[PDB]
GROMACS .gro file of C-alpha atoms in nm:
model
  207
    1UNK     CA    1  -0.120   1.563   0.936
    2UNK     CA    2  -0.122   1.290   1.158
    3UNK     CA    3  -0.147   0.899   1.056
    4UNK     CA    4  -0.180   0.618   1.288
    5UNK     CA    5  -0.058   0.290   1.145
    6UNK     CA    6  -0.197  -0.002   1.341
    7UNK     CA    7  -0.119  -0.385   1.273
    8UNK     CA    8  -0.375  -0.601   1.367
    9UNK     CA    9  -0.249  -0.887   1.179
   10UNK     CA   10  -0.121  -1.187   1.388
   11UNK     CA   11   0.201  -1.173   1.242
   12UNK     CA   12   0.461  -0.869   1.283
   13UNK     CA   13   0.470  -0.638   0.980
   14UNK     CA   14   0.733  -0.394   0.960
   15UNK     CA   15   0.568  -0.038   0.848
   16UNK     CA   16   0.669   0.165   0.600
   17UNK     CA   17   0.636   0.536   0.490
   18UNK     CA   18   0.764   0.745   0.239
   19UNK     CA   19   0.754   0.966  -0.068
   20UNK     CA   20   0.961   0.810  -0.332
   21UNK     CA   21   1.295   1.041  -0.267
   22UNK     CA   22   1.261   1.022   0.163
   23UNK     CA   23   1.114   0.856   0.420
   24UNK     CA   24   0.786   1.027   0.567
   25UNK     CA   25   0.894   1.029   0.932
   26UNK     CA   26   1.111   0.785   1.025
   27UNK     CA   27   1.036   0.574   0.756
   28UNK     CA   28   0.960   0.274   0.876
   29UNK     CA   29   0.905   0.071   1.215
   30UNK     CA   30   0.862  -0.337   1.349
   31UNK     CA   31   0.501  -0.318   1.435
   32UNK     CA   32   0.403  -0.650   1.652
   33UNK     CA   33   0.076  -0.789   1.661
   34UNK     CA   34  -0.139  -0.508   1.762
   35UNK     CA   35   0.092  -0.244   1.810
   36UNK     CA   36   0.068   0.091   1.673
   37UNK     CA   37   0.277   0.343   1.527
   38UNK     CA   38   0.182   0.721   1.520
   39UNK     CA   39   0.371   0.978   1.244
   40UNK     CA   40   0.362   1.334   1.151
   41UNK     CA   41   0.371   1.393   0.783
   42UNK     CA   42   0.427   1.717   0.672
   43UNK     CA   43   0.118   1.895   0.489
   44UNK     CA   44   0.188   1.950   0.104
   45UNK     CA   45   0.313   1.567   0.098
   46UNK     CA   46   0.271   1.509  -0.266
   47UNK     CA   47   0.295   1.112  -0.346
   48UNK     CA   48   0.324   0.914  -0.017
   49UNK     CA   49   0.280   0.587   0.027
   50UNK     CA   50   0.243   0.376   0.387
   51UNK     CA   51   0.259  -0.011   0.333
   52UNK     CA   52   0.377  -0.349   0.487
   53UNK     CA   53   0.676  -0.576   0.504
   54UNK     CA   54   0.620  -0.877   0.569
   55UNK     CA   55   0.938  -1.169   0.696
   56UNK     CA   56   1.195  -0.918   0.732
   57UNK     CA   57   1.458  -0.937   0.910
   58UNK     CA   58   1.778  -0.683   1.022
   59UNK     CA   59   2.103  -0.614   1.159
   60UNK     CA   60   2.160  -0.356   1.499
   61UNK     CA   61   2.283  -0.136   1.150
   62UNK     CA   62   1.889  -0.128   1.028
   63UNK     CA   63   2.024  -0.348   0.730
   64UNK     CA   64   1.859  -0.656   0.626
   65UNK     CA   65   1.590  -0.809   0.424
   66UNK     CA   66   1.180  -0.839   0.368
   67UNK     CA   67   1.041  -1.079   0.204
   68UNK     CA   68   0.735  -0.840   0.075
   69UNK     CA   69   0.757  -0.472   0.039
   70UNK     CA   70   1.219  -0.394   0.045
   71UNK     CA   71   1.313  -0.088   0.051
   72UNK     CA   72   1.659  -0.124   0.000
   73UNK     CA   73   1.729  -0.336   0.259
   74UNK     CA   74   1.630  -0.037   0.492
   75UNK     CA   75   1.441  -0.046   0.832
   76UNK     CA   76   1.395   0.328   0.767
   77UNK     CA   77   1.239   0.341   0.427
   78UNK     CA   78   1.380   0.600   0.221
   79UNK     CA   79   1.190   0.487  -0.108
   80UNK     CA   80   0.902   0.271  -0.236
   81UNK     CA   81   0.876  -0.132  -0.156
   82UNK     CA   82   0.960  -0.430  -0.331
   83UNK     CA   83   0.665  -0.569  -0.516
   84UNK     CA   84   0.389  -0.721  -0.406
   85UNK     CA   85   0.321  -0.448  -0.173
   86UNK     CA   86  -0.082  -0.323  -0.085
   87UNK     CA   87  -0.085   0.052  -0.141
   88UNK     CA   88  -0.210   0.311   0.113
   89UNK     CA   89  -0.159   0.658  -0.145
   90UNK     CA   90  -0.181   0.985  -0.057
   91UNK     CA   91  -0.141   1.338  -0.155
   92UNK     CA   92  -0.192   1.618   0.086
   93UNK     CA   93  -0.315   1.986   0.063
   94UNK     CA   94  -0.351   2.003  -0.283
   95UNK     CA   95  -0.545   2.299  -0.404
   96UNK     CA   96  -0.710   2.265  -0.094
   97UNK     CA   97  -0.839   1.900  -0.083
   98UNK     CA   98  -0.634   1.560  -0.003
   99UNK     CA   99  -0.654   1.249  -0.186
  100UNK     CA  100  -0.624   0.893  -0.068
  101UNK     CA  101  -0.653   0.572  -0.275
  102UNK     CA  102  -0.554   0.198  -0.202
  103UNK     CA  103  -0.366   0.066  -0.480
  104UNK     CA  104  -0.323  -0.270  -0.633
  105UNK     CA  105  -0.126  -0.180  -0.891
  106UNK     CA  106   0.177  -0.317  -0.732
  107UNK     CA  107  -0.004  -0.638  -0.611
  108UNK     CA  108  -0.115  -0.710  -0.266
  109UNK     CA  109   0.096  -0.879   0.057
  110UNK     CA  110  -0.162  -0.759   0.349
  111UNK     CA  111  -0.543  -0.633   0.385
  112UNK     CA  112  -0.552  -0.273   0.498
  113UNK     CA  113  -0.796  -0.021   0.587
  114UNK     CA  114  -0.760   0.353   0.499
  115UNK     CA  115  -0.995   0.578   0.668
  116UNK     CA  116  -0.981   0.959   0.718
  117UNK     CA  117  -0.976   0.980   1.158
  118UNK     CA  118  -1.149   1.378   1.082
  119UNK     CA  119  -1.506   1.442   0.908
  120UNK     CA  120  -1.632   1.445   0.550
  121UNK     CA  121  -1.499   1.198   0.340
  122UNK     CA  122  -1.530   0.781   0.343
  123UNK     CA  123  -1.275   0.567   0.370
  124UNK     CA  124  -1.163   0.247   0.157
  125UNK     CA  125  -1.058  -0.093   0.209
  126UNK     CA  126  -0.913  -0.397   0.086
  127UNK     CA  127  -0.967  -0.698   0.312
  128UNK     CA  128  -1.054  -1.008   0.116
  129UNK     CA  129  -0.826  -1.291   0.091
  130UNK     CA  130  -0.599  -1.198  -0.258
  131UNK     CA  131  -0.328  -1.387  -0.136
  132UNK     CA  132  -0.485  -1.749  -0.081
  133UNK     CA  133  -0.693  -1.681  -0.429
  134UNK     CA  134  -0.425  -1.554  -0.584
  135UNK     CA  135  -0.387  -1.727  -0.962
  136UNK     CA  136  -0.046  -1.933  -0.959
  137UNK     CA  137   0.126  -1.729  -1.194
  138UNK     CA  138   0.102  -1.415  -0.990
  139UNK     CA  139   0.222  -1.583  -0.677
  140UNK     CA  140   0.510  -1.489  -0.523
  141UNK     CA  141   0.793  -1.722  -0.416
  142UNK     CA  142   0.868  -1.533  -0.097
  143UNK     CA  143   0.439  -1.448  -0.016
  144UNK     CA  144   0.231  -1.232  -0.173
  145UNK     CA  145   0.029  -1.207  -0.488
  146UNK     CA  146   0.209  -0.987  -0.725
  147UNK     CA  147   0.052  -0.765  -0.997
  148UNK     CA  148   0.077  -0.888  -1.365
  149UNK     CA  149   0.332  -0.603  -1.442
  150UNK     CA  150   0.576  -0.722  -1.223
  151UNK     CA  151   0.502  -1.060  -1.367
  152UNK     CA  152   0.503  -1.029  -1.754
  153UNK     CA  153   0.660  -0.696  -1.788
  154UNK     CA  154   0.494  -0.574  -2.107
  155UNK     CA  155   0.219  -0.294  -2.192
  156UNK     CA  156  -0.067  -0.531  -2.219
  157UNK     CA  157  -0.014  -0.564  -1.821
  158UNK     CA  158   0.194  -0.250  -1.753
  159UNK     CA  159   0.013   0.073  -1.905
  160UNK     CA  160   0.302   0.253  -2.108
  161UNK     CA  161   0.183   0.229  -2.431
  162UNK     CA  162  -0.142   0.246  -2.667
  163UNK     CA  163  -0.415   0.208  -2.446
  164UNK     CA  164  -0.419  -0.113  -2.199
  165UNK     CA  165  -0.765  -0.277  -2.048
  166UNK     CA  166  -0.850  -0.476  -1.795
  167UNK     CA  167  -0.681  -0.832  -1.783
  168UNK     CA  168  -0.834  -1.124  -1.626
  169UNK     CA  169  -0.517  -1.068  -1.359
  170UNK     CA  170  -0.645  -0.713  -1.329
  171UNK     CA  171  -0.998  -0.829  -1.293
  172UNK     CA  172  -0.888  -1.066  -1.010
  173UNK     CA  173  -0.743  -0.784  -0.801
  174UNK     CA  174  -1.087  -0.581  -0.892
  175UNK     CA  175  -1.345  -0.825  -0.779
  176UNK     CA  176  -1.190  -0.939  -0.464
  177UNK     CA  177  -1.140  -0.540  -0.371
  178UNK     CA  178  -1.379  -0.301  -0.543
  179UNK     CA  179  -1.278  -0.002  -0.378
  180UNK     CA  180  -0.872  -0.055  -0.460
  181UNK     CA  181  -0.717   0.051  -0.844
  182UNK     CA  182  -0.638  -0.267  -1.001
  183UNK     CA  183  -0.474  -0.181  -1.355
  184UNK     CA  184  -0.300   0.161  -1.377
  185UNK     CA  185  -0.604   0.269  -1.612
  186UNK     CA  186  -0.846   0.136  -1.398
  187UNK     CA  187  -1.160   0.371  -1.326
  188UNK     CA  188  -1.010   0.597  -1.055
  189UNK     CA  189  -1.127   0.472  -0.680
  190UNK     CA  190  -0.952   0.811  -0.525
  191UNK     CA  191  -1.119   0.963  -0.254
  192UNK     CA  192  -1.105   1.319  -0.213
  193UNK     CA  193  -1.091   1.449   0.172
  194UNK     CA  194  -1.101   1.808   0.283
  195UNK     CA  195  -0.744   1.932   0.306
  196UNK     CA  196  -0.553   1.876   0.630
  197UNK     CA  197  -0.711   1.585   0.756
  198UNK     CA  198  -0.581   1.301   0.930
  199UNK     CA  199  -0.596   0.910   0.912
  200UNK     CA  200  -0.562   0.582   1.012
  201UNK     CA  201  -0.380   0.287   0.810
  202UNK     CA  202  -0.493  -0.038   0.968
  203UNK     CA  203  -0.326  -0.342   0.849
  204UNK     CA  204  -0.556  -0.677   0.866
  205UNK     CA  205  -0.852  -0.460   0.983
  206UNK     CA  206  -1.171  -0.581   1.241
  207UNK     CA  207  -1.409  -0.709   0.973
   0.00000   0.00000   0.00000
């Protein structure tokens, strides 16, 4: 399947893409204002992610350091990103059909877009302004709004035990973006796609 990752923010973002054990592709790449980055991920891809790093910086080495979104100190992301991180999620060629969400869940550096580029199946965004709204507690020090689970670290907020609901920090992240999961038991905003298509991840999309 093919993805095109665009960044139309005015700042650089450095792109990321894996699968939780490997990088999709190469993994991640310095995408300047309005550049665009084009990757193959191999159908059956079960649990990728693409997101955002924003203030990074690195060594010749691909060492170094983001200020949203690490992954290890990696250019090339092996695994998943450093809280707060907005979530592009997929799963591909599943009994036929792919599945895309944009996730919350792990707070929310950059506005993205995630539309299907192929027929039959809508896309979803998250666009409004978390960051600036963002309630003080969930700010982070280095930019960003992070989710409450990061924050507090317990069930109410995390989702291991019993049966959590929403939380006014959960209900934040839900009525600024609708169409985006907010609280891991949030009612699922997945969109199903016909199998095999491709997509486009725009960061800081045209409104």
């Amino acid at each position: 399947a093919t993805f095109e990752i665009v960044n139309r923010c005015s700042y650089t973002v450095w792109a990321a893409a894996s699968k939780g054990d490997a990088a999709l592709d190469a993994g991640g790449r310095q995408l300047n204002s309005g550049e665009s980055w084009t990757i193959n991920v191999e159908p059956g891809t079960n649990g990728g992610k693409i997101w955002a790093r924003t203030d990074c910086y690195f060594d010749d080495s691909g060492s170094g350091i983001c200020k949203t979104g690490d992954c290890g100190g990696l250019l090339r992301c092996k695994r998943f990103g450093r809280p707060p991180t907005t979530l592009a999620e997929f799963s591909l060629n599943q009994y036929g059909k792919d599945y895309i969400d944009i996730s919350n869940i792990k707070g929310f550096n950059v506005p993205m877009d995630f539309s299907p580029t192929t027929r039959g199946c809508r896309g979803v965004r998250c666009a409004a302004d978390i960051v600036g709204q963002c309630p003080a507690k969930l700010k982070a020090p280095g930019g960003g709004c992070n989710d409450a689970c990061t924050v507090f670290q317990t069930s109410e907020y995390c989702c291991t035990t019993g049966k959590c609901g929403p939380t006014e920090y959960s209900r934040f992240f839900k009525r600024l973006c609708p169409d985006a999961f907010s609280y891991v038991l949030d009612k699922p905003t997945t969109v199903t796609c016909p199998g095999s298509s491709n997509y486009r991840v725009t960061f800081c999309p045209t409104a």
